[PDB]
Amino acid sequence: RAGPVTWVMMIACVVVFIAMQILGDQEVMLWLAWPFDPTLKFEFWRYFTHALMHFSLMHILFNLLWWWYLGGAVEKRLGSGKLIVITLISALLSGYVQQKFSGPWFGGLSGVVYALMGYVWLRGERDPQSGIYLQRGLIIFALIWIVAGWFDLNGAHIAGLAVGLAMAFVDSL
Ligand SMILES: *P(=O)(OC(C)C)OC(C)C
Numbered sequence: 001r002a003g004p005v006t007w008v009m010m011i012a013c014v015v016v017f018i019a020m021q022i023l024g025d026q027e028v029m030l031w032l033a034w035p036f037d038p039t040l041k042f043e044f045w046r047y048f049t050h051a052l053m054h055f056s057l058m059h060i061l062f063n064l065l066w067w068w069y070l071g072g073a074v075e076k077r078l079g080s081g082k083l084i085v086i087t088l089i090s091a092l093l094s095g096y097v098q099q100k101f102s103g104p105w106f107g108g109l110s111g112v113v114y115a116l117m118g119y120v121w122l123r124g125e126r127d128p129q130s131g132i133y134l135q136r137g138l139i140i141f142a143l144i145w146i147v148a149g150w151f152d153l154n155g156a157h158i159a160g161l162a163v164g165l166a167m168a169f170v171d172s173l
Helices: 004-023 025-032 046-052 057-078 080-101 110-126 136-150 157-171
Strands: none
Touching: 004 025, 004 046, 004 057, 004 080, 025 046, 046 080, 057 080, 057 110, 057 136, 080 110, 080 157, 110 136, 110 157, 136 157
16 A cells, blocks of 8 residues: 555645635635745745645646555655655745746646656666666556646646656666
């Protein structure tokens, strides 16, 4: 079954998704979003919590489905700590880029999901010995949920994806 870190993310995403369904999306955003006024610049959870908000049933479900498989793989084969670093960096960076081009009003775990897709894939190609890899067919359906993100079927998913690849590079050495 699934490790403590994969578990918690899903829960928090769920609780927050529940929180969002009850209170309203603006209301939760008001507390969890990337900082949108300078009074909020010190509230350091905000650079991260944007990842926990999903806006539709299909948003959370796919992110969590992908998180479930990819996140859970890294944690089994490679450890809870590794998953934490990947999560922290990709949320910050994609969030930063997202915020920069579009604004502080966003959410979703897909920046992180992209990093995982890029990470697991490259790490399996360049370090097959480690027992990590993205299976062929999954590469296809992953390229889709990437394409889903890139044509709006916003921009900072390259950041998420980059971080994922960048880290897989380092560990292959
Ligand atoms: P992602 O969770 O969603 C894309 C699949 C559209 O969104 C960014 C803001 C992380």
